[PDB]
Every structure is written in C-alpha cells, then in structure tokens.
Design a protein around this ligand. Structure first.
Ligand SMILES: CNC(=O)c1cccc2[nH]ccc12
Length: 161
C-alpha cells in the first residue's frame, strides 16, 4: 500500500541530493549514511529540527534517474568509522547523517517531467544543485511516483517521528 508512505511524507521537507557516482549511493544504501558539504550539512541540520520528516531524494549525476529516497534519522555527527566514499578529500565533507531508506528503487527522469519545483524557478524537479530544497507538494508527488519498494517496512520509521 501507500498509506504509511503518505503518513511519513505528511508535512515533510524534501531535498535533492546529487551524487557524482553510483558507488556513494550504493554505500549509502548499504550502511544507511550520507555525508555532504558543510553548506548543505547546515541546511539539513536546521531542517531536521524543523519538520516531522526530512527526505533526501538521490540522483547520480548523468544517470538520468533518481536512485531512491530516504529519511534523516539524526542530525550530522562526527567521529564514526570512516566511510570510504569515492571523492573527486574526506576532510572536506561535514558530519555523517544516519538515514532510513524508504525506497531503494529507481525512477527515470522521463517519469517526473510533469513535476516542477517552485523553489527552483519551477524548473523540472530533476533540475537542481546538490541540496536544492523541493517544495512539499512537488516532493510528495515525486516520492509517490517511485515504484513501491516491498522490501521496506515503514512501521519502524513511523515510530521515529
Ligand atoms: C558522499 N558524499 C559525496 O559524495 C559528496 C557530497 C557533497 C559534495 C561532494 N563533492 C564531491 C563528493 C561529494
């Protein structure tokens, strides 16, 4: 069904996360973690305190698709085990956010062409810098476009809200 998904997304905030490669998204899916540059780390930490759910929607640059979406389960922290990200230095990154995946399935950009993001000049929602916020209605509809991910049980995520 889609009812628990809709509940998780109610009054959520949404951020576009652009990865330079598939390896980092694979690491994020396997380990439930993300790290971004401090400019975006500060925005995500502010959002985490401000809303019931903060949703990261992932797209690997040049792939023509989104690779899934996840919900922040924590503000960023430092001092964990070093994550072997593939970078173009690791010190340049901010802290590490724990995330709970909501959907690990892909969605091609051709399927989101009817969705524009008011917070990026009403450009198609696929267009945006890493960290671009997606307005609530556009973000909800985008997440609802993804194929259902039957491996996921949102019961435990609902309890974190
Ligand atoms: C896992 N985090 C990243 O891959 C990342 C996040 C934000 C800016 C970035 N610039 C180069 C890599 C990168």
């Amino acid at each position: 069904g889609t009812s628990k998904l809709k509940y998780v997304l109610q009054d959520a905030r949404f951020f576009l996360i652009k990865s330079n490669n598939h390896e980092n998204v694979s690491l994020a899916k396997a380990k439930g973690v993300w790290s971004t540059l401090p400019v975006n780390e500060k925005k995500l930490n502010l959002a985490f305190r401000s809303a019931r759910s903060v949703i990261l929607i992932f797209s690997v640059r040049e792939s023509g698709k989104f690779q899934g979406f996840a919900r922040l389960s924590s503000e960023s922290h430092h001092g964990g085990s070093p994550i072997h990200w593939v970078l173009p230095s690791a010190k340049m990154l901010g802290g590490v956010f724990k995330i709970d995946w909501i959907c690990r399935r892909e969605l091609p950009f051709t399927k989101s062409a009817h969705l524009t993001n008011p917070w990026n000049e009403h450009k198609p929602v696929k267009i945006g810098r890493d960290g671009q916020e997606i307005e609530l209605e556009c973000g909800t509809q985008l997440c609802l476009l993804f194929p259902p991910d039957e491996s996921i049980d949102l019961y435990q995520v609902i309890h974190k809200m």
